[PDB]
Amino acid sequence: LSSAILSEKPNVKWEDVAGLEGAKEALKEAVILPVKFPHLFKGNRKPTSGILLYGPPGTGKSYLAKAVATEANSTFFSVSSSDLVSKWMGESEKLVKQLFAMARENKPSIIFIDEVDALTGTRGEGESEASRRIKTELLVQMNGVGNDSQGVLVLGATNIPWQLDSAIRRRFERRIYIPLPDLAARTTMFEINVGDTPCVLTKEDYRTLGAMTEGYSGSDIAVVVKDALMQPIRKIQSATHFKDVSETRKLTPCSPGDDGAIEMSWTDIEADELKEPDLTIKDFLKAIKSTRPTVNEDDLLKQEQFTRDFG
Amino acid sequence: LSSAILSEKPNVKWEDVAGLEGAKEALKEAVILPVKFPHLFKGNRKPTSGILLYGPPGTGKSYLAKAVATEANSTFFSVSSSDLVSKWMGESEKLVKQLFAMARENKPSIIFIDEVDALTGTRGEGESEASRRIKTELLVQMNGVGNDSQGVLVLGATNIPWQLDSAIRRRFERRIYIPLPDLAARTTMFEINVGDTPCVLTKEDYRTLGAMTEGYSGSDIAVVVKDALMQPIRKIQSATHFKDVSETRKLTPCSPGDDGAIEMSWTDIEADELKEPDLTIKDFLKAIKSTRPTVNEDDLLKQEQFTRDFG
Amino acid sequence: LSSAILSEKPNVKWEDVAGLEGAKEALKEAVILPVKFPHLFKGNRKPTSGILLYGPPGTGKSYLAKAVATEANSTFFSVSSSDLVSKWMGESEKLVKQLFAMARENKPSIIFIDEVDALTGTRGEGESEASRRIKTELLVQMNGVGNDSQGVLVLGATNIPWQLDSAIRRRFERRIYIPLPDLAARTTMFEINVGDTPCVLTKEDYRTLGAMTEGYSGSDIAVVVKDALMQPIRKIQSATHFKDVSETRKLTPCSPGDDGAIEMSWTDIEADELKEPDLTIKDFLKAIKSTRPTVNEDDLLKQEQFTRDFG
Amino acid sequence: ALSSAILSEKPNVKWEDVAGLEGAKEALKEAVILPVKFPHLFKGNRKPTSGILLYGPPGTGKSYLAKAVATEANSTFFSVSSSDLVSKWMGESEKLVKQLFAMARENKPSIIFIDEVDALTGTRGEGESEASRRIKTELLVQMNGVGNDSQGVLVLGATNIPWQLDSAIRRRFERRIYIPLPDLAARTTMFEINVGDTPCVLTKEDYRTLGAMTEGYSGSDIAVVVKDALMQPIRKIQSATHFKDVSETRKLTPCSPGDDGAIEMSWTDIEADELKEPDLTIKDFLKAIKSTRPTVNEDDLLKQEQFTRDFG
Amino acid sequence: AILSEKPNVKWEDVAGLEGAKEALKEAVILPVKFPHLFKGNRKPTSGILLYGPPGTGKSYLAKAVATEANSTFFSVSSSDLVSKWMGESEKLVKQLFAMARENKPSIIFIDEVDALTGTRGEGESEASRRIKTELLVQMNGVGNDSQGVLVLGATNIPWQLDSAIRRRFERRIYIPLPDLAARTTMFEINVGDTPCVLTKEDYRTLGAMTEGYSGSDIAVVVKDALMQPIRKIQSATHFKDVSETRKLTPCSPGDDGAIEMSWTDIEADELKEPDLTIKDFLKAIKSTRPTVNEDDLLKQEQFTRDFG
Amino acid sequence: AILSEKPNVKWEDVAGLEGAKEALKEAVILPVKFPHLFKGNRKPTSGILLYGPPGTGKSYLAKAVATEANSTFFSVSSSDLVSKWMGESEKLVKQLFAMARENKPSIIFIDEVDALTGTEASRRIKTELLVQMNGVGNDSQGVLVLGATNIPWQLDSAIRRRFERRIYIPLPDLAARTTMFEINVGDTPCVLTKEDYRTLGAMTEGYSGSDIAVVVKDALMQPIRKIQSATHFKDVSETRKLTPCSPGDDGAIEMSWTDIEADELKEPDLTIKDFLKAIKSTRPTVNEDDLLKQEQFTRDFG
Numbered sequence A, B, C: 001l002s003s004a005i006l007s008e009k010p011n012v013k014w015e016d017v018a019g020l021e022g023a024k025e026a027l028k029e030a031v032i033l034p035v036k037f038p039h040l041f042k043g044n045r046k047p048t049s050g051i052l053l054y055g056p057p058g059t060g061k062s063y064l065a066k067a068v069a070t071e072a073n074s075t076f077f078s079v080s081s082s083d084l085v086s087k088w089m090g091e092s093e094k095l096v097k098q099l100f101a102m103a104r105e106n107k108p109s110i111i112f113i114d115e116v117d118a119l120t121g122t123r124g125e126g127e128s129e130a131s132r133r134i135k136t137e138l139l140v141q142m143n144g145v146g147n148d149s150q151g152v153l154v155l156g157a158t159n160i161p162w163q164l165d166s167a168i169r170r171r172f173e174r175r176i177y178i179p180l181p182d183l184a185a186r187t188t189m190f191e192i193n194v195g196d197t198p199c200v201l202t203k204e205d206y207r208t209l210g211a212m213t214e215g216y217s218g219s220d221i222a223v224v225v226k227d228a229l230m231q232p233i234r235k236i237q238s239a240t241h242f243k244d245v246s247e248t249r250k251l252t253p254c255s256p257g258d259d260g261a262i263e264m265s266w267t268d269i270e271a272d273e274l275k276e277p278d279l280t281i282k283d284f285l286k287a288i289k290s291t292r293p294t295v296n297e298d299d300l301l302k303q304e305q306f307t308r309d310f311g
Numbered sequence D: 001a002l003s004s005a006i007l008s009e010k011p012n013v014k015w016e017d018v019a020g021l022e023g024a025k026e027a028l029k030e031a032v033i034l035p036v037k038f039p040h041l042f043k044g045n046r047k048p049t050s051g052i053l054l055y056g057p058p059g060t061g062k063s064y065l066a067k068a069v070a071t072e073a074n075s076t077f078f079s080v081s082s083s084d085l086v087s088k089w090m091g092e093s094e095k096l097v098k099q100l101f102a103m104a105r106e107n108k109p110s111i112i113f114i115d116e117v118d119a120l121t122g123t124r125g126e127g128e129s130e131a132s133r134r135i136k137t138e139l140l141v142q143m144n145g146v147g148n149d150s151q152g153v154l155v156l157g158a159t160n161i162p163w164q165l166d167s168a169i170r171r172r173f174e175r176r177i178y179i180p181l182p183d184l185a186a187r188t189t190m191f192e193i194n195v196g197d198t199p200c201v202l203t204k205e206d207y208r209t210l211g212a213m214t215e216g217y218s219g220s221d222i223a224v225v226v227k228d229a230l231m232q233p234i235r236k237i238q239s240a241t242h243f244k245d246v247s248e249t250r251k252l253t254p255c256s257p258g259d260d261g262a263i264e265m266s267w268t269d270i271e272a273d274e275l276k277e278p279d280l281t282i283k284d285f286l287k288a289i290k291s292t293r294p295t296v297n298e299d300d301l302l303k304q305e306q307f308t309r310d311f312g
Numbered sequence E: 001a002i003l004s005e006k007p008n009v010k011w012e013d014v015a016g017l018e019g020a021k022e023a024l025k026e027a028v029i030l031p032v033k034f035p036h037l038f039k040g041n042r043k044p045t046s047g048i049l050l051y052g053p054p055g056t057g058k059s060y061l062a063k064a065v066a067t068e069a070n071s072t073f074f075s076v077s078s079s080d081l082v083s084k085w086m087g088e089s090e091k092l093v094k095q096l097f098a099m100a101r102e103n104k105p106s107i108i109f110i111d112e113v114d115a116l117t118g119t120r121g122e123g124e125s126e127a128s129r130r131i132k133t134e135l136l137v138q139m140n141g142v143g144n145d146s147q148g149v150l151v152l153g154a155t156n157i158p159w160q161l162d163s164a165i166r167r168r169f170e171r172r173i174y175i176p177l178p179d180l181a182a183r184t185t186m187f188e189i190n191v192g193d194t195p196c197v198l199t200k201e202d203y204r205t206l207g208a209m210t211e212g213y214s215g216s217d218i219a220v221v222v223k224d225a226l227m228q229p230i231r232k233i234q235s236a237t238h239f240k241d242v243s244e245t246r247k248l249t250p251c252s253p254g255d256d257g258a259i260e261m262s263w264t265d266i267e268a269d270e271l272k273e274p275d276l277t278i279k280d281f282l283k284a285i286k287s288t289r290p291t292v293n294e295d296d297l298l299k300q301e302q303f304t305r306d307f308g
Numbered sequence F: 001a002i003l004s005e006k007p008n009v010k011w012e013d014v015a016g017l018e019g020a021k022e023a024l025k026e027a028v029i030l031p032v033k034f035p036h037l038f039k040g041n042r043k044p045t046s047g048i049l050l051y052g053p054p055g056t057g058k059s060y061l062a063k064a065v066a067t068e069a070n071s072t073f074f075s076v077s078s079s080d081l082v083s084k085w086m087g088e089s090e091k092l093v094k095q096l097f098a099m100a101r102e103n104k105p106s107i108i109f110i111d112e113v114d115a116l117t118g119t120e121a122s123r124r125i126k127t128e129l130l131v132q133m134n135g136v137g138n139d140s141q142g143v144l145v146l147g148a149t150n151i152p153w154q155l156d157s158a159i160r161r162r163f164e165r166r167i168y169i170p171l172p173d174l175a176a177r178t179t180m181f182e183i184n185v186g187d188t189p190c191v192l193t194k195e196d197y198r199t200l201g202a203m204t205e206g207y208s209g210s211d212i213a214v215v216v217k218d219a220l221m222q223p224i225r226k227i228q229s230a231t232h233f234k235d236v237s238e239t240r241k242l243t244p245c246s247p248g249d250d251g252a253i254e255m256s257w258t259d260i261e262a263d264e265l266k267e268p269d270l271t272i273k274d275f276l277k278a279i280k281s282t283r284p285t286v287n288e289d290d291l292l293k294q295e296q297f298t299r300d301f302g
């Protein structure tokens, strides 16, 4: 049997995710509003049962699922494609039945599924038995004869929504496209991902950054901020020569031959008594020259096709 | 001989389904007429043994099965593809035999199977042992040597009727296509799904709605009515400011600066003593602009192919 | 000691089967002629041991098996694929051995197997242990070292005879194709399936019906006759108005305003004392417009392939 | 004390009833008759054959030849399918094999027949190599025992699928023989055998005309066209209206409407025995030839020429 | 089912391409040397890809990272991951990252990740979607602790690697063909304790002769060289005394003291093996062609020139 | 499941293969003959793979090595390990190495090493074997593993790598086939000359020892075959003795073997020509594309 139970909460708050307030609105009214205000949702007025998120890779879908998982205050299940597909013949499907069953047992609950494109695609006869049996149980077990469709919430994610079948497209009754973040949201993600590190710039300088970075993803922002945090490490471990500055001794990397320039390596230098140089904009522009964006623009044209129709 | 079964207690009545009068006629004469009038069915006049329902997703198939399940007054079995396919080798087929066996034990009765496409498809050799053994037992056990084909009524549903094998197609001896609905039925579903909520419109305004919504499904109607029932709380949480109107205190969202406009949030306001905004066409039309028709039209061309031939 | 025996008593006459005079000849000489005339079969002259029937679905195969079962006057066994395939490892095969064993114990006897395609197909290694063990025991136990092949009789049915393996094809030594019925046989099935219901037509009108219905199955005939028997219930409970005609009170549906036309519903009318208008030609033609032929014509080309070779 | 179910009674078929098979007839006469009649020849270097396989397309006469050996044995003829070897729990699946060859050596001289050896063997994955690899392994040892027990037993293998037979058991059956479809003269012989004691109408060259008409059948095809030929005069008895006396007191046969002594009646009207059936005529034979096209397929013959062309 | 080892390989054991060396010394040794620098915004690298032509020592360098790591160093090829059944192909991935998190702090190596990528099109459908999907979501996802474990990827085909897994391996390093001096160093290492015959500039002549090999190519020409004088001894007729009591070596037919015999004829020890010298080396260089191809190097310069 | 023996097969009992033989002599016998040669970091081979087409008696050659190294021969079939024993196979591979350690000098023979790898469960056998072949180090001295494969190209590269030395076992050449015919008839009464044996040799290009063994087993029975079927008996020469002869000959009576008295039959003498018959009715076992497939392996992993 083994009951396939998996549920754990990380820490990602609301405003960690920047921008796209339609999805924030729909998920606050789909998650917080049923739990905090159950009396409003009564009779004809019912909460949303199936919500699909989609878009290009790294626009913040699974991180938003993390934010819902932290801000849930509910039995947050989560399952990959691993725990559903079993060995023999029968546990591949009865575990789905027990998943939504015990999900309804621990109601109010939220279910997230990542990359539902691995379970769809009934057109043709490829991926035959797994697609028909497992996908059929996802349909009928999602709603069907005597399933309590109230209670639980099914969060779907994908990168390919056009290969998603129209029936499961109707199952995910409120679908939301997640675009590449605009100027202001990327300004916000810059001001978030700098964090507690002492920066040097102002808000309109972050606006200059977001103007320079037209058309990235969230991971692209995470790695240009990472590289911006990782240039002074290369300055400290780099080359030969440090120097004292200023609570008892403190040395930082400096060029060969300078005011107090001893010749050494980071290894030579004592615990703590290292001075790493500030973060800097030059670090930002160096990170811009480091990495090209990952997303392709014809795939964005297909996202504008399915979004322009069904979004 | 360990038997694992199930049964239901649903709640759906006749007038909730709009249109579909042929299916309503065939199921009233296939369900109500045998039980209420058993004396009419004698000798040459025999009840229907196999009924197929099919069509695009969300035209009301499984909800009609709910209506038959409530209006049955009979032992209503229902089985998905899960409970038939077993682990080892033998219980995958003997459970089918015990299903129709105990179904004949509790006669008169109705059996529903959802998404029978997971049990068909003998063409080729894919899904070999499960398809031949389980599907063979569905054929022979459905009717065969000494099966009492009288009594139990088998209601079939699917979304893919062309992959259904011709033998089971003959088993479901009276098949009915369920098209996309029309103007008047969607007017009826609007006037049903508004329910007890105090609306604002008239009947010809619902006709204007159904004229605006050419080519939806029933789920599309359910979610535009759902979104229409969410715009009140969207207005309550909107901005800063509520106001008393009118059984002891009752406040609703209003614009900044109005007759009795206090400044607050929904959180500030007491249990129940919240007032909800009246349904207006603007919420309806906003919900129409929110969501495209879900299903495609080339799939409708294939439904017109199989319907135009075999319907 | 397993003892998974089952047999029964149906009721189907010879002459309720239409067409198929070759199958009628082969089964009269295979069933009636051994029992009534055992002295003719002695020494070199031996009865037939294996007879196969095949064809498109609903050409009357299993109903002919019902007719043999009624007209047997012999211990008629019948087994599906369910009772042969067991759980563990050994009872899947020893039950076959006990089946032909106790079949020879109750000689003279007839064995029918429906849809033998679930036990064949040794080509490749799919369905490996069940196919090799169970099918091997079907071969050797059917005839082999010391099996008394005289006595019993193995009746095979299928819908797919080309996937039947050539060895079992040789086992079923006298195979018969069962086509779609022609004009006269469908005229006969019309005149049988009208039964005791008072009709309105003549024999050449049934010839007009069979001319209108070119290329049906037996189930198609059964459901157009069924729909023809379900039109007078629709008319007797349709709209408003019945009328007395003629053993104490008897009312039938009639148009609004007629000779003795009271206004009521079927519900208003007393047990029995309600009679529906006799089947009419229009009901027949309406049933012809109701339902397509079931079978497809490329499958008929494969039936002409296997029939043209092995028939 | 976990013994089995064996053969005791032999099914009487004569040695002359088969046709063709001259290599198999030679190998089994030298493998059965020659050890018993001449034990002094097999000594030292000269040893009898230990493993003999028969194979071929279905219905070329393999199991019927095993019937002929079973009648002509005069020895304790065991026979076992795949049923009696595979047991329930874990251990009797293999100890019964050990007791089979054990009690087979107890009742020596003796012959062992195994039909459909591909059901014994056959591995694809983990499920196929469980509880069949054990029994296969015990067969592997107990037929490695040629150096242990050369004299005594003989293992006759039959199959229809010899390519799925594993190469190790292929080496165990050390002298394998392909059994093809029969030719003109052998089918003439099977016609003249299967007519039996029934009074025929034809001559030997008419049977040659039959075998020329029936190019490429099996033995079962011959058995059913002869069977249908033995059903045609009773079909004449059932058919039409009208019989007629001919010739030990009254004897009537079917004849056309209006003939020399043509009374009008049905078979039902006619007294026990005093019926006369029509003698088999070439027309019933040729009608039976038109009734059933050959059963086996020629691509299967190409695979028999593959395995025969290699390992035959 | 799952392998583990703390191997021998050191940074000085590795010869060549010191930018990848200092990069892995940073991303692996810097969590070891200064874990207290990595806090809050400053986080260690999670996914590092190595790639290029075959035989360049990526697994060997991973073993150098393993020895200087002091951590549970896993390593897996594709052979422990290919679908034989329909679902130990995926649950073993789940147990791999699961037990990898059980033995944290840890390092995971995967060799030739090109056998798990390539979602474009529908070829290799169920294995690619299921197994690759679990690699993505299980690599980072809803509630995966992405901290801790380190995923080392290797391949020979990086362009067929999908862009999503390309982003997963967030710090990728191209490994080019090495140079003269590093192959001189690998010659002087792989000769080992065997008594050679040459000097350092003769190894420079060797590396000049061997322009454009891999590390495995060096390993097999040194291996064949450790068959070469033994191949002289196993060959031919005639030995000869030279010089602690009797000592004979192979010599040509007809020479100063050339007796005719075989090695078998000659007494324990009292054999004088031919010296190990270059003609055998240069003959081994003429024996074997470089395996790798240069248009594949042009594609490595394409993907490296763009994304490197 | 594990066979053990102190075999008695000399080099001369193994037809041909002189090249392998000479490789094995210096690979295995030299270390054993003069152990003082292998002090310090100089260590004798401890894995040898024997590869080549089936029917060359790789096993028999292996026993000769054991006989000549004066060692116990321990042996196991990998097919049996993978299928028959399964569950207990880890235990078996253990015990096997354990016996061999306890019994130095000794040799482990693993037949069909390819059959260790693929078509989870036998992944254990692979894994245990590898751990054990690392046993040269815990106990490097005194044991040697000889693997045998017909399909070296299907042999797990990890296992492959544990077999330092690889030796090709070719199909027999003229001289070897000639020896095989002689050995296979041994003492049997026949009238074959030295030249006939050579002829039989020359006439079986591409045959294996196995193939030759079956042909010879077939041929020797021919005189028994003639006597059993024999027709027309003529007297020759201890009181009456008749043999088959053609229709119409010096003393040619017409009869069948059945007609002739116990013993007083003279069976036909063995002939070189008769084997020629047997050669026609037994095709060689081994496909001709195997040469290349095996030589591809000699080129790549030799």
Ligand SMILES: Nc1ncnc2c1ncn2[C@@H]1O[C@H](COP(=O)(O)OP(=O)(O)O)[C@@H](O)[C@H]1O
Binding pocket: A016, A017, A018, A019, A056, A057, A058, A059, A060, A061, A062, A063, A064, A189, A217, A218, A219, A222, E141
């Ligand atoms: N709006 C956002 N605010 C903060 N972090 C973000 C945002 N969007 C993306 N990220 C970063 O992206 C990563 C998660 O991406 P994910 O949603 O898993 O990609 P995908 O959408 O392809 O699943 C996290 O490291 C997170 O920090």
Ligand SMILES: Nc1ncnc2c1ncn2[C@@H]1O[C@H](COP(=O)(O)OP(=O)(O)O)[C@@H](O)[C@H]1O
Binding pocket: B016, B017, B018, B056, B057, B058, B059, B060, B061, B062, B063, B064, B189, B217, B218, B219, B222
């Ligand atoms: N005609 C209809 N009348 C009332 N509700 C409907 C109708 N069509 C659809 N619905 C609603 O939409 C959903 C879809 O109906 P259902 O029979 O379950 O279709 P499906 O199984 O194809 O999704 C149901 O949950 C039901 O509440």
Ligand SMILES: Nc1ncnc2c1ncn2[C@@H]1O[C@H](COP(=O)(O)OP(=O)(O)O)[C@@H](O)[C@H]1O
Binding pocket: B143, B144, C016, C017, C018, C019, C056, C057, C058, C059, C060, C061, C062, C063, C064, C181, C189, C217, C218, C219, C222
């Ligand atoms: N020739 C026929 N005569 C009478 N009824 C028939 C005939 N063919 C079919 N039927 C009717 O149609 C149905 C289908 O025939 P049946 O033998 O059950 O088909 P199948 O062999 O495919 O199961 C049966 O209910 C039978 O009564």
Ligand SMILES: Nc1ncnc2c1ncn2[C@@H]1O[C@H](COP(=O)(O)OP(=O)(O)O)[C@@H](O)[C@H]1O
Binding pocket: D017, D018, D019, D020, D057, D058, D059, D060, D061, D062, D063, D064, D065, D190, D193, D218, D219, D220, D221, D223
């Ligand atoms: N040579 C033959 N002579 C006479 N009858 C034969 C011959 N070969 C086959 N038959 C008949 O054909 C049938 C098949 O013979 P058999 O060996 O049992 O074949 P199988 O087991 O493949 O069905 C039997 O009824 C047998 O009487």
Ligand SMILES: Nc1ncnc2c1ncn2[C@@H]1O[C@H](COP(=O)(O)OP(=O)(O)O)[C@@H](O)[C@H]1O
Binding pocket: E013, E014, E015, E016, E017, E053, E054, E055, E056, E057, E058, E059, E060, E061, E186, E214, E215, E216, E219
């Ligand atoms: N840069 C290097 N320094 C030292 N040895 C190397 C180097 N590159 C390759 N080698 C040698 O090559 C052998 C095999 O290299 P391998 O790790 O298989 O290459 P790959 O990068 O394809 O995995 C190793 O045993 C190693 O000793």
Ligand code: BEF
Binding pocket: A167, B055, B056, B057, B058, B059, B061, B062, B157, B158, B159
């Ligand atoms: F989803 Be429905 F049953 F087409």
Ligand code: BEF
Binding pocket: B139, B167, C056, C057, C058, C061, C062, C157, C158, C159
């Ligand atoms: F149902 Be039938 F036998 F095609």
Ligand code: BEF
Binding pocket: D056, D057, D058, D059, D060, D061, D062, D063, D158, D159, D160
């Ligand atoms: F013996 Be047969 F080929 F069934």
Ligand SMILES: [Mg+2]
Binding pocket: A140, A144, B061, B062, B114, B115, B157
């Ligand atoms: Mg449904």
Ligand SMILES: [Mg+2]
Binding pocket: B144, C061, C062, C114, C115, C157
């Ligand atoms: Mg049927």
Ligand SMILES: [Mg+2]
Binding pocket: D062, D063, D115, D116, D158
């Ligand atoms: Mg047989």
